[PDB]
Design a protein around this nucleic acid. Sequence first.
RNA 1: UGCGCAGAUACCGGGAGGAACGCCGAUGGCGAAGGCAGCCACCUGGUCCACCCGUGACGCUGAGGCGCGAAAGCGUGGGGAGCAAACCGGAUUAGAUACCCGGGUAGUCCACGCCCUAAACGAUGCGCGCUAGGUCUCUGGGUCUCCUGGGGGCCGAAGCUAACGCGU
Lengths: 70, 88, 119, 101
Amino acid sequence: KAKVKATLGEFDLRDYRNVEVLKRFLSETGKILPRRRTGLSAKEQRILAKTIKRARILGLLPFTEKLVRK
Amino acid sequence: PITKEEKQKVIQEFARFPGDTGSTEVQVALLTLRINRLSEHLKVHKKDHHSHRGLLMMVGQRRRLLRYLQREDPERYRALIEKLGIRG
Amino acid sequence: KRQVASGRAYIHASYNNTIVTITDPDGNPITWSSGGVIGYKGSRKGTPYAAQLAALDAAKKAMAYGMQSVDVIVRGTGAGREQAIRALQASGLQVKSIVDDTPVPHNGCRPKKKFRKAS
Amino acid sequence: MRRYEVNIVLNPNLDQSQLALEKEIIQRALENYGARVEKVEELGLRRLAYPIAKDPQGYFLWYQVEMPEDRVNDLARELRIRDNVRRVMVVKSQEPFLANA
RNA sequence: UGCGCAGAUACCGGGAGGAACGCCGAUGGCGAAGGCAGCCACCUGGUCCACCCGUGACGCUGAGGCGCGAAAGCGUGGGGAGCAAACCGGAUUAGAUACCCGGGUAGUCCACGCCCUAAACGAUGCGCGCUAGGUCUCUGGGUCUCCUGGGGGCCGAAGCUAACGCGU
Ligand SMILES: [Mg+2]
Ligand SMILES: [Mg+2]
Ligand SMILES: [Mg+2]
């Protein structure tokens, strides 16, 4: 399938507000997706984990969700 | 921190001639700046030892620099430690 | 005793006993069952059969209150698991949705020495 | 004195009296601590991803701003003395690292 | 053993409190070691690169000295959720001062002060110069198929080694 960067166009991944983008880097359990799936570089992947965690504290992205249909 | 201007002021007040960034005298000066800043941060943050190793090194680099100066031009040595207040 | 039309079945699987409870759409218990609550006692309450039985029996008690449909919520791993789900599905009592919801700390209290054999 | 970003999430249940009473007290603290103010932003009422203080929505103030850095912890401490102030998050302004191109 | 009809377990709401931070997470990164992992701010150390600007051998090592030094431990004062030497019970056994189960004090956490040890391990002291390559990887820089640094791994020229291995 796709890497989550292969999807988007250009974006500021220091931007802890843009939930419309940042929301795509989470699993269905709202867990930060691994590099192998994000398609990101070690360095970007570092920066993102940060931005994602900042969003979570503002209330805009989730810490967790629950698996639907198991 | 030590903002670029503060640094720049000190290079100025110590350079042997204009354009002098890296002489024994500018070097000693700058260490002394770093030291006094680092020492103020240490009287408060007593348990910060990793930083304190940085100090020991700066204090060495300084004595090793000053040792050289006192051996080449015992004169601008005496002047430099007076202009700073050190060692003796 | 009220008639509820739909609500929640909570399955709590463990390696020692499966237990199932049924509630109204705000999570208030209507009825419930467990391995022990059928006959099995001691190490048999875990077996997928025990799970199935308990599960089915709880559903029957809820169908008494006229319960017609449920959202399932499953929690924990253990033998009776897919079997208690398979049960509710095949108890008539219609299965609207399923959802695992197992608790997990984001690294919380020190686990008992049995559970850090992964030390 | 460096540049920052003050985010405040607020009680999503206000009429303009309460609303702008809070929004003013803010401008006082901001002012009463050294803050000058580049941009403002007010998307306001948005749905949180989990309920903060019992409440499925939040009111969003964001300010870019410059201030004496040795006070930015003090500012933010005072920003949440208020109860309608629910989250106060202050962040060093930053070059915006991008990706895809 | 234990806990439960003084209503437990399982479920929904609310509150209090302590400790540790899931996913990111790596064959990764930083540090002289011990060691360092939620997020924010302030204070602060080390380090790498590029420019080739400044000083002009100002260097290397380092007995003794001083400082740091996991865990356990000690003193005073806090704190105490989970876990748990000792201990109190249930088991198992020929016995079982154990391994398995139920509880549980010190302790684990915080302040200040002690102790100064370890499979404190790369079982490899520090620094410099020299001697084929290939491959993966972190972080720089350029003229960005690749090139040039600095770190992290594996394979292996020459050579070395009792051997196993080591091998920019
Ligand atoms: Mg200790
Ligand atoms: Mg003690
Ligand atoms: Mg025990």
